Every structure is written in structure tokens, then in C-alpha cells.
Paper text:
TENTs include poly(U) polymerases (PUPs) with a subgroup of 3′ CUCU-tagging enzymes, such as CutA in Aspergillus nidulans.
We first obtained crystals of the apo form of the protein, the structure of which was solved by SeMet SAD and refined against a data set from native protein crystal to 2.25 Å resolution and an Rfree of 24.1%. The protein conformation in the apo state and in both complexes with nucleic acid is essentially the same. We observed small movements of the palm and finger domains relative to each other. As expected, the overall protein structure is very similar to other TENTs and adopts a bilobal architecture. The active site and incoming nucleotide are located between the palm and finger subdomains.
Residue numbers in the entry: 248 to 373, 375 to 598
Write the structure that this text describes.
Amino acid sequence: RRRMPYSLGTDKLEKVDPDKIKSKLSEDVERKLETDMRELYDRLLPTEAIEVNRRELVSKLERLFNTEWPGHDIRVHLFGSSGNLLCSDDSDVDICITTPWRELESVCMIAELLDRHGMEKVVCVSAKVPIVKIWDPELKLACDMNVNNTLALENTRMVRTYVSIDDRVRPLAMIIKYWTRRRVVNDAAFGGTLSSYTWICMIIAFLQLRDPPVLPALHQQHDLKLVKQDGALSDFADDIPKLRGFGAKNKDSLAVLLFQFFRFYAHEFDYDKYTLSIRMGTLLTKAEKNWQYLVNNALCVEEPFNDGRNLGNTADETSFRGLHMELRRAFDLIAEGKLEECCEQYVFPK
Ligand SMILES: [Mg+2]
């Protein structure tokens, strides 16, 4: 299911004359783009009826696990879009199951239990982190779940903190995520594109590099870190009420930020030289991380909790060329306020 066909080649896109790149939206385009974005954001927001279904699934799973394997304090947690304020009604339910009972990390044992109790399309992937995928026919929800993936819970908590800092982040990130789904550039497993978490990091990194910045570098704000419930200091600043309002110095609207996001990644950002690091909040070079030797390093996005891992390693040179075309395609359409055409649903050739 290769998203970017090998026929694209690997050539770098041309450097367009800077005078031919639109510098800012016109007054009419921004006003219409602003209303079109807030109308779409209202459609993208989740509904209460589906929110209670996701909580019913969590409770149903937690009862099934504790009744089948009692005495192990098995708890079910939401993470990803389900826990960072960025999910929609059609989003999957991403679940992290925790227990001190290490035997539960054999996930096909979980797959058998859920299939035995009526779940459908039950597949286990025993893989980076083992995953059980189900489809709940009663609640009409798809669910991916892993066991003791505490890293996913922490960086979900980091994304949620970033979303809580500035009220423009949630609508901006949800609209961009919607764009990644419509263009089908959010499949790092089979399509060769970028993961949902990779895109969120690219959004945060863009917001950190604005002048003035919309978001801070939470990993570097040492004086704003709280003691977690395990007794350890949080790796990132998480004092949300004290962090709120950090981006108020930036006066750009939602419409301008969407325009600048695509403009940044279409023409401004030098993909060949720099690594995007939301951990540092500044640009790093590939050379200072020795990342000029990484295979699939055309796009370097540093994972904040493991600076030795490039989130963009799922994109080869052909996939990156197609990804760069989509970002330039998006920039040209948003520069004219064409939000609907920017989000045209991609369809795979037969
Ligand atoms: Mg403040």
C-alpha cells in the first residue's frame, strides 16, 4: 500500500524564487479562511455520546481483564488521540494496559479473551510494542491496545500539556491531522509516510519557532516541572495553569498559523540541514546528531524522550519527495483560502 509511488523519483524539489512565494494572506482570504476553519473545527470536535462510548469500552475491558486474571491490579488507560484532546468521533481508541504482572505482555492471550467475549477483527502483533486490535460491534469502536507501554502515556501527557498551553493549538492541530487523514499521509506502518505522533511533533516544532513563539520548550523549562506521582521530576514542564498564556505574545490568528505551517514546511524549512526538536525548542543540525548517516533521514524529527530516534525514519527518499509535494500543494491552496480543496480525499489508484 505504498502511498508515494517509486515513479516519483528522489529529486529534491526546486528552490522557488522567494519573491514568488506569497508572504501573507490578504485581508479577505484570512477572514474567510478563519470562518471556514472554525466551522470545520466544530465538525471535528467529539460528541458526548461517542465520548461515553470510549469510556464504556475502557470500563468493559478493565472488567474483562480483572475478572479473567484477578489479583494483578490491571488498569486500562487512554493514550494518543484519545488522551491528548485531539481525537474525533471516528478516531480509534488507543489503549495502554498496565499491571505489575509481566505475563500480560503476551498480547495474543488478550486477543483470545476478547475474541472469546464477542470482539471482532481480533488480531495480535507480537513488533516494536505488541498490539491487539479489535472492533467492538456493540460500541462501534476500533481499538488498538498494548501492555505496559509507559512511554506512550508520558508523551501523550506531553502533547496534552502542549495543547493546553494555547487555545489555538487544539483547532490548528485537529485541522492539520484531518488534512493528513484526507491526503492519506499518516500511515507510517504500511504507506511509508509519517505517524500521527510525527505530525504532532512537526506542528509543535513549528509553533515553537514562531516569532514570538506560540509554544515553549517544556523539556527545557526546568523551573516549571512538577514531581510525578512516582516521586520523580517530570522530564518536561507540566505546571499547566502557570504555563497557560505563554503564546499570548503571538497575535496571529488560526488562519495565519495554518498558512504559516504549510509555508514553513513547503518552502522555508531546510530539510537537508536541520533536525526538528521539540525537546530543545530550537533547530538542531543533522551533523551535530550524526544523523547524516541515518538511512531515511531526508526528514529528521527528533523524538523528545529518546533523542537518538528519528520519527521521520519511516519515509524514504521517494516518500519524502511526495510528502514535500503534498505540503507545497497544501501551501498553494491555503494561500488562496481553499480549505476544502486542500483537504480533498486522496484515493489509491486501482
Ligand atoms: Mg503565562
